[PDB]
Design a protein around this nucleic acid. Sequence first.
RNA 1: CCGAAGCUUCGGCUUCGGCAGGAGAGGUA
Lengths: 63, 21, 226, 237, 691, 48, 83, 577
Amino acid sequence: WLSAASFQETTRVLTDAAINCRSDKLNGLKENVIIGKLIPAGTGINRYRNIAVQPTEEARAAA
Amino acid sequence: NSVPGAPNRVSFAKLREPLEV
Amino acid sequence: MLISQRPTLSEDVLTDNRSQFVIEPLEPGFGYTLGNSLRRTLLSSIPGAAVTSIRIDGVLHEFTTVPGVKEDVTEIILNLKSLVVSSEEDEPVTMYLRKQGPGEVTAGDIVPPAGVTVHNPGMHIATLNDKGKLEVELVVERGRGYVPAVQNRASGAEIGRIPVDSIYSPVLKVTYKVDATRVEQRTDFDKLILDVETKNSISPRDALASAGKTLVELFGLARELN
Amino acid sequence: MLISQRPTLSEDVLTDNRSQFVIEPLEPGFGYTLGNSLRRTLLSSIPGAAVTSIRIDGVLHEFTTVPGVKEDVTEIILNLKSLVVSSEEDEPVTMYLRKQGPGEVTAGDIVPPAGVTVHNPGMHIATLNDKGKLEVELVVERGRGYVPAVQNRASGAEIGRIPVDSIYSPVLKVTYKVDATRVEQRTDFDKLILDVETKNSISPRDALASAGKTLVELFGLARELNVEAEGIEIGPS
Amino acid sequence: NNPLSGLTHKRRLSALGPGGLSRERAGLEVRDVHPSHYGRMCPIETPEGPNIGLIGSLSVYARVNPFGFIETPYRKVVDGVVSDEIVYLTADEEDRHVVAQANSPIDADGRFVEPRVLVRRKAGEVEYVPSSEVDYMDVSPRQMVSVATAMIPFLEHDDANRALMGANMQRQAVPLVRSEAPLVGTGMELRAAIDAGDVVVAEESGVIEEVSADYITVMHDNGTRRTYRMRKFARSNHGTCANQCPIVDAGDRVEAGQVIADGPCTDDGEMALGKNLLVAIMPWEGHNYEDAIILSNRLVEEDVLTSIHIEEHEIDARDTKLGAEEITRDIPNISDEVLADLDERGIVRIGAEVRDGDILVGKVTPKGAREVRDTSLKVPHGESGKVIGIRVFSREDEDELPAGVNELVRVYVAQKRKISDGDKLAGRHGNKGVIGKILPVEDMPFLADGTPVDIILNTHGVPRRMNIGQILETHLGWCAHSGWKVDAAKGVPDWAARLPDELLEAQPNAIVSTPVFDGAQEAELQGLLSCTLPNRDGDVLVDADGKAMLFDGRSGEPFPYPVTVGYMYIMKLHHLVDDKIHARSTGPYSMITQQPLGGKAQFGGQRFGEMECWAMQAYGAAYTLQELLTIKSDDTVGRVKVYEAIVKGENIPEPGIPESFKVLLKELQSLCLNVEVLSSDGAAIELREGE
Amino acid sequence: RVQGPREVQIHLVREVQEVYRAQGVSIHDKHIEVIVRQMLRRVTIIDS
Amino acid sequence: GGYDTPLGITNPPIDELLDRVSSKYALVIYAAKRARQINDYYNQLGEGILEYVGPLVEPGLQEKPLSIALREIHADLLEHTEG
Amino acid sequence: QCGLPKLMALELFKPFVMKRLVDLNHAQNIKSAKRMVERQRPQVWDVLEEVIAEHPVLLNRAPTLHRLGIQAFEPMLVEGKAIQLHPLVCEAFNADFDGDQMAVHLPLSAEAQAEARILMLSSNNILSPASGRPLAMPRLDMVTGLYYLTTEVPGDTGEYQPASGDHPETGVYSSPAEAIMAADRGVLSVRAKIKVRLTQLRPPVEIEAELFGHSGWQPGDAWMAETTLGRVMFNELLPLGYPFVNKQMHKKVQAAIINDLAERYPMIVVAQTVDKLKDAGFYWATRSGVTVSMADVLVPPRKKEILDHYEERADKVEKQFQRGALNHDERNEALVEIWKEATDEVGQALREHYPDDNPIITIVDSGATGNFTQTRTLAGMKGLVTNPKGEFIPRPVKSSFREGLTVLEYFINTHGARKGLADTALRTADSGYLTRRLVDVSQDVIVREHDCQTERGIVVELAERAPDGTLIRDPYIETSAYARTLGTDAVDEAGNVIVERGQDLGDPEIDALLAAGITQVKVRSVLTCATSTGVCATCYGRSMATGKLVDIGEAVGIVAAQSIGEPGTQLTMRTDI
RNA sequence: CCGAAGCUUCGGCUUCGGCAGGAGAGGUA
Ligand SMILES: Nc1nc2c(ncn2[C@@H]2O[C@H](COP(=O)(O)CP(=O)(O)OP(=O)(O)O)[C@@H](O)[C@H]2O)c(=O)[nH]1
Ligand SMILES: [Mg+2]
Ligand SMILES: [Zn+2]
């Protein structure tokens, strides 16, 4: 309902969502932008966000 | 023209005018 | 075949403001770059003198009118921009214009100091009816180029001084023309005819010599190696 | 008057016959006053010597192919016009190249007429392959700049004196670019970046050293009409 | 802005208002040029935005019925001869008659020469009927244009869109410190300045008795004496300067209707909105790429394009609760350094130069001291100029002030503004661009005698926009500036048969006039371009084609091909870069949603709209968007820590949660909606901080 | 209903490209397929 | 390649920086995690004892830690694993 | 690079300057440094030159119709109050210089700076993401300069004369330096055909095969060229290993060269090459002699008689209407047809008179700007115009703009300049709505994996055969078959395979397929992907912006919507659509 | 959050003082 309420016809979607007791899982671009989180695209996905970097053994030993 | 003191500005017009604005 | 005749200069006087200079025989090609080298130094870096501030008595800013003069202060200011002044001292000198009564204020009413001479005793500065007097105090200085107005409260001054724009160039118009000699038997040369017209403060042959000193002293950081 | 900031020249040797002089800081506008006149004084004032005519043997008429050699007359001219020669004389001299036999005639074979020298004696002139003989009579004179072939009219003395072009200049390519620098809070200053490429008979540094001595005497005809005139003194070294 | 805009405002017909149309309801059929607009509305002058076709201008000869219907005049014709009797006809009565065309050959007696004439039939149908049915005729060729469109020379050579822009941009010019009349004009400029009313004209005949800089005294022939005062350095509605100057001597004889004093944009009685500049049409190293303009430095050293701008500010003294505010020099919390200006009353002194931060008038609001506040009028950010006048109103000297307030001062500040990079220039034909570069006078192309050019325009923009009137204007301007003389030793040449006898010779710096639809042909221009006079030395710089050979001021060699040279009329537009630059790091914030304020006067930020987020999401930049949306706009707790981290040199912290989301949640909860934020195992989060 | 799902996607990706190709605008077909794919993603129940 | 030396923000060339990584979305995180370590080393050396490593290559006069991180990446002195 | 005013950079970079000012012992406390910064003391103009070093900013112009409406530059301090923009980004920004404004934003953290420096830099975004064509290309002035430079003029000064008897070749040069020295003296023109010995330039393919055969060690191997000087000075701008071109540089040729360089070389040499092409274009535009007068716009030699013959038939139709033969639509039709033939007869009696050097001809014939319809309107005859509905008025406008229209022609001409201006301010509404509706539906399509290993696909036409037996290439094949992944191997006449499953479809693969007698091919398309959420990289194919396979995590949906939407709106504004 | 004033051991502590919404019209790209 968060992504559909901000597109068109706010009153109708809000009324239907209230009657049906809907739940939002916050798994889209618009919802993550609205609540203030990292969008699930580009550098905000799990593979790229959890990269661990440390100097190699040889460089650490040399310096 | 038609003004008491005005600069002399020569014109290229070839038609005459029977009315004033 | 290599030439040996060193270029030689020669002047001819057409008036007291205009003169021509011939410089033959240059090398095939080297006839337009020398002309532009001297024109670009003759129309920029020649020192002179110009007024840099005025102080009328009774006025405070430049957006007002004096009583008895047929112009405001912005037209006396825009009419004090065509005054050809001269100087010999490197320090501000204060002149004085004091005229009164019916008439027309010209440039011959500026009593000069001792070392400054106005070279235009017939320009216009204002018209007076029988109800006004003009007391001005012009400050003359020396310099080079075009410096904009030196602000007031950024120099430690009072509230009556009116800064003014100063143009210090004594030169008016400069051009050249080349007469090429493209014959056979590979004996070619050139010929430049420079024309220098100065305003009235510097003779047409002292500007060429200030540009010749500037260029004989800037092309010396090249022959410093050998 | 003083300049405020004194310009300084610096070099940057890239190769052996190429450099990159930089002159900064220059007052606003003086980067274009010093560029074109240094380029033109560099490419048309330094004296030198070059070949001005050849007389290859066996060509009374049609200049197409010479018996024995594997090259047309135009390639012989192109290879006998890139010779870095120099002469310490005044009037025209004369050189000779006469190699007979299977081989590759090169610049190390023109016997020098005691006074003129060849500085690149490793260039290939032709490849005599079909068992023949080459005989060339060259005329090396001195001059300045690039003079196009002086088509003559001897009508007898020029039995087959092909006239060639003469590259008398010891410099080959100069280019300049004016950039911009900052001195304090004022940008819009200037910086000249020359780029002289020379031959093998002069070094790139004697060029911008003998091109500031034929211009401190060309702009010295002006500072002699009135010695006391007042200018922009540059300052102490 | 200038007299032309004021005159045009009073002649506007608007289709909106309480009883008309709407910008959304109006379609595409109410914004069209109906065939019945001929002589009643101008088809060219109209706005360019959402009000295109909903606003128009009345024509020069039109007049209104006692019912509300617009009329237009015609000449009655009988038996194929045009008479001189004028009858006014409305659009509903001219559809039963055949009306001829203004540009129709008429003999000495008044009979049509051409066998067939172009007329206008019932339903706006144009036809080629044999000339024997005509019943009416036009009065003049400029009957169908308004007062601002009738000021463009060579209008018939321009496309409609470019004439539209030229007419709209003639009303945005600013007055300059010195004015000069066009070299090439149209003749409408004289009666467009008297009727506007910004000049002073004499109501009777007499001799001039006294002339000064601010009053003129005229003695009439009967004995009465009348004196006229002047407005010196008055501020207009848009911050420009309105200055009047006398143009009469001390002994002149004056006739009724003669112009006595000049005005803002007037030169000797005729409107002058720009200056005459020497032009060259050529590309130059890419500095005039894509509608940019290159200027010379002689236009800055000689004050050619300079305008005064005056601004106004005001403070009050409304009695508060405890005590009442009182303007005084005593501002405890401030020292004596920033108090030299303020005189012994609390107001600045006429003549003091102010910066951005200077105190103009100081006021201390009390409590009835050690209770006073620092409430002193300051100069809004980025503003300066000398104080040219004050105006103090007090009720103690008997004055009508709004109840509650006790002191109202009004300060004025003027600043002479020059030309610079980014300022907008324009012409009368649709030329328009900002200034890209200003060059030294030694770096400019120059003619054979050493005269530099003043402005350079690109040649790639002319052919594809179909405004070729500017090149004709430059040719005619050069011919007028230099002066010409036609030889008639062997009779008048064939191309000059129809020229008047006063146009066969002219002096240098002559003024000409080419009416809007009956002017100079092209054979006449081609013949005049080969008769112009030489200069001081016997040289002709511009050849028979209108082209001249120029030298290159940076390298010295001549340009390989001739270039077009001439004179053109250039105006300065009221879109200056000093009024559009803005930047911000931190400043005031809103109240409900704690986002930065909006606008330039309130030190606001720039909107990062919806379309700008799609580009960020398509680039893949997930961290830039998050930082742009949380710690730079709404995260109240993260803004301060971010500032401290930047100042201390540490790492930027992790963003929190925006405040606008909480505002939205309370909005949804106020409509009786049970919206909650759950966790991974129920147990709704509080979402109110506080711990 | 007459043809099947595969022919509606050709009819759509062609009728949309004709309009853009008439005026000389070049867009790859892979950009219209992304949007057409979302227009065919649901099923209508007849009987449950 | 046969390019001239890059200046300013285009050094090191990205066509060689992209040969040490899997895609252009991992280089961003690689550099942005090395830069934070360099800054922490700078801001912890003057206070106490830390566990991070300083710039493995010689810095300039006043260089941003991002530039040092990219220069270290280009010289093949680091290693990383993907989540 | 960009140019940033000092008074704007001071306000944007305030805290970094305050930190540097306190650190460098220029102040005592943070409040003192803040006051000193706010007072513009002369000590803050030197730290604000290493503060802004290597710190990118973002530039934005509204409307933002696609991705390239935001780009990252490196600031430079200039004097003035205006921002300086590179000439080559105006096509992507759609920005002229008659009053536009742009906004600046400042990244703060390390991740934002890294994204701005790596993902968004202007020199990395050259190819358009919707069609793969280059956007940062020479245009307008540069095209004229580079078309003038590389043009061959027959019979010029110092050309090659194959003479005999009197003198030899007379016009063979031994190096480009000698040719330049000769051209500095006036002996030789830049556009005169000569023979010059080239050493550091790569020969064309056929010359290389004829001379060296095995390989050309171009660092020091000499050959012979039959070209002009301008072509040599143009070829010295391309990379070292690029073969000699020897062609006139129409805009199509430049686009082809740029596309080849972009697809076969790294992305840094292309950015370094466009910057040096622009310099030569701007230098040679001012010495090409393109200028507008009123003696260059010429009239058709015999227009009077054409119009007379096409007017007699019109009064004949009129007489026939007076006799009642036709109603009113037939009169209209016949009039229209006569006046739609006369117009193009003037066109074809004007396109021959004009010489091929006239600026008006050489500005539209070089591909810089404009059509020939505008040139016919300006100097020939405007033609039939439309009425307030949509029909053509029988009476034509027979006068050009060079001779001036009359009052009635000018009045009837105003019905087509108002329509365009109302559509410019009304169609953009529908366009915007369309964009916004397209973005929202396809906002959940994201590349999620690398390969779904599906076997389905679609069939692509890929050219058709003529009855004679010669294949005809499909007119629309760049936008339907290029940049795709194969689904099944391409076999022919029960023989071997030319390309294998899982290979990109470039032009070599296309020509190999075409030269074996294969028309129908099966590709992998997004319409038949097996991935549950989002799509996979192999099915999508190749990314148009970079020219390689796609990256896991991109937002294909937004890209697509933007692409589609942009064309429409732009077309509306400039103009049907 | 900013300013003024004190203690200040130099981390900081204390007193006082201070706010920003709608509607309409015209314009630039
Ligand atoms: N979104 C909107 N943009 C507008 C509007 N009006 C003008 N514009 C902008 O004005 C710009 C006009 O671009 P132009 O066609 O004038 C540039 P061009 O070189 O093609 O001009 P010509 O020389 O006439 O060919 C257009 O791109 C818009 O960005 C509007 O109402 N809405
Ligand atoms: Mg624009
Ligand atoms: Zn797939």
